[PDB]
Design a protein around this ligand. Structure first.
Ligand SMILES: C[C@@H]1C[NH2+]CCCN1S(=O)(=O)c1cccc2cnccc12
Lengths: 353, 20
């Protein structure tokens, strides 16, 4: 067979130890999920420095804690705008998830609080910027470099899926690089805790699984499809399905055809054909062997999964770091005032925050 | 080429999710 006795025993033991870790991780998650933390700081504890990112979600600002001098990334949401965009449940759920999870590649929520006007999530500052920026600048990542990042996503999805969390928002724009070169996942607005199927049309066109496009009920296998898209884009420099307009992207996604650059290794192409598998009964991550079909694939043969989890692998790329508070890996944004009305707004809606 | 097609797509920048 493929493994002799020693290798088979070692793999079996490793897989059993993952089960044991995940059982404990779930116990710990459920305690925090059922009794979430609230109101662990306030606004005047922080100096506001610079806007790191903006969007319909609100903004994220680099802030400095006045006593410790520690920097953090503060997400600011306007309660009235959240209500208007129909994002109450997503916003409450994101904060509830972030305060309950614990994994080395998931950003930590260090404080949260609210005031009359806004909600505030104070997260660790991840100073390396978006994977997106590095990927577009470098062009494409070597297979070893792509693999190092992919392994972290595999472990992160193994963890989240064990908690019945579907992620649904994977793309290089949503992955940050930390000072040691490891990934941080930050956005949980589209994540959902569901054991079976769900139906919402959500995500980013290039990363949508066929079953989402086709208005089917779908499950956690959409995250494994999205991993295939991410690995492809990291290694090629462009995603597997693109076009001028989303409708044309969706036609290609559902077609069952993908083409690969000539520099992709055979191992990489085989992994991607099994992740970018339109037939759910055949997609890796969705079979009886679960995540092990991915972790044991030849493309990952050199990956030491425990060493990745322990952060003991030397990263292939370290972002430039000019010190605490350095924002050079993020774009520049127009700075806008932070208004706190004298009158409480949308109080009942956000009682749980 | 595929790369040129990607540039021509106009989708080389940060991509919004559907809800946006
Ligand atoms: C929410 C936006 C949305 N765009 C995609 C990337 C995520 N950001 S972010 O880079 O401003 C960011 C979010 C959370 C924690 C961070 C920690 N350190 C830096 C930036 C951080």
């Amino acid at each position: 067979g493929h493994m002799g006795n020693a290798a088979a025993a070692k793999k079996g033991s490793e897989q059993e130890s993952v089960k044991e870790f995940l059982a404990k991780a779930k116990e710990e998650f459920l305690k925090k999920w059922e009794s979430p933390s609230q109101n662990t700081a306030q606004l005047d504890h922080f100096d506001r420095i610079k806007t790191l990112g903006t969007g319909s979600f609100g903004r994220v600002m680099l802030v400095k804690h006045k006593e410790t001098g520690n920097h953090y990334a503060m997400k600011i949401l306007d309660k009235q705008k959240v209500v208007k965009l129909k994002q109450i449940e997503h916003t409450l759920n994101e904060k509830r998830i972030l305060q309950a999870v614990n994994f080395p590649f998931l950003v930590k929520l260090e404080f949260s609080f609210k005031d009359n006007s806004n909600l505030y999530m104070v997260m660790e500052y991840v100073p390396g910027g978006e994977m997106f920026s590095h990927l577009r600048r470098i062009g494409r990542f070597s297979e070893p470099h792509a693999r190092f990042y992919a392994a972290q996503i595999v472990l992160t999805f193994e963890y989240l899926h064990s908690l019945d969390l579907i992620y649904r928002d994977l793309k290089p724009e949503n992955l940050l690089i930390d000072q040691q070169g490891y990934i941080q996942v930050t956005d949980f607005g589209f994540a959902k805790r569901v054991k079976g199927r769900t139906w919402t049309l959500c995500g980013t066109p290039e990363y949508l699984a066929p079953e989402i496009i086709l208005s089917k009920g779908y499950n956690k296998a959409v995250d494994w499809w999205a991993l295939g898209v991410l690995i492809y884009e990291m290694a090629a420099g462009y995603p597997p399905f693109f076009a001028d307009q989303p409708i044309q992207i969706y036609e290609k996604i559902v077609s069952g055809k993908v083409r690969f650059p000539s520099h992709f290794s055979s191992d990489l192409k085989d992994l991607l054909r099994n992740l970018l598998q339109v037939d759910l009964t055949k997609r890796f991550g969705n079979l009886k062997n679960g995540v092990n079909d991915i972790k044991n694939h030849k493309w990952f043969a050199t990956t030491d999964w425990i060493a990745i989890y322990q952060r003991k692998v030397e990263a292939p790329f370290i972002p430039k770091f000019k010190g605490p508070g350095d924002t050079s890996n993020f774009d520049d944004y127009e700075e806008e005032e932070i208004r706190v009305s004298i009158n409480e707004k949308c109080g009942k809606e956000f009682t749980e925050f | 080429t595929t790369y040129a097609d990607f540039i021509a797509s106009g989708r080389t920048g940060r991509r919004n999710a559907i809800h946006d």
